[PDB]
Design a protein around this ligand. Structure first.
Ligand SMILES: O=C(/C=C/N1CCC[C@H](c2ccccc2)C1)c1ccccc1O
Ligand SMILES: [K+]
Length: 115
């Protein structure tokens, strides 16, 4: 069945808002967040970040129809952004981008408050 429920459409809309966000120069902030590198690639990350999260994991949960509500998806995004702001320094661009995307997430959730 190609037709999504209102909840499914709302989940997709929030996911896509974060994924598709581009700055004024056209840089897609989500690019580095889609797939976390491997443990062999970033040993320190997996030793220090308790619950690794990336947007492909979120997408997967969504496509599997496993998010029962919007809050649950937001929680995973917040986890990811907090992991990024934990691992990386406040001065780093990745840290900064995480803060921008967090705002896109909350703004998107809020703008869809009344659906
Ligand atoms: O913190 C994250 C990544 C950090 N490092 C330092 C910035 C550049 C590193 C990188 C470099 C090249 C390709 C992919 C990732 C990743 C991160 C990536 C995806 C999902 C959550 C994250 O916290
Ligand atoms: K930090």
């Amino acid at each position: 069945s190609k037709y999504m429920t209102p909840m499914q459409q709302k989940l997709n809309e929030v996911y896509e808002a974060v994924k598709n966000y581009t700055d004024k120069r056209g840089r897609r902030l989500s690019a580095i967040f889609l797939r976390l590198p491997s443990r062999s690639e970033l040993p320190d990350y997996y030793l220090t970040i308790k619950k690794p999260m990336d947007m492909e994991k979120i997408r997967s949960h969504m496509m599997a129809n496993k998010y029962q509500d919007i809050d649950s998806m937001v929680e995973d995004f917040v986890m990811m952004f907090n992991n990024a702001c934990t691992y990386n320094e406040p001065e780093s661009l990745i840290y900064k981008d995480a803060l921008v995307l967090h705002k896109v997430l909350l703004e998107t959730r809020r703008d869809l408050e009344g659906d």
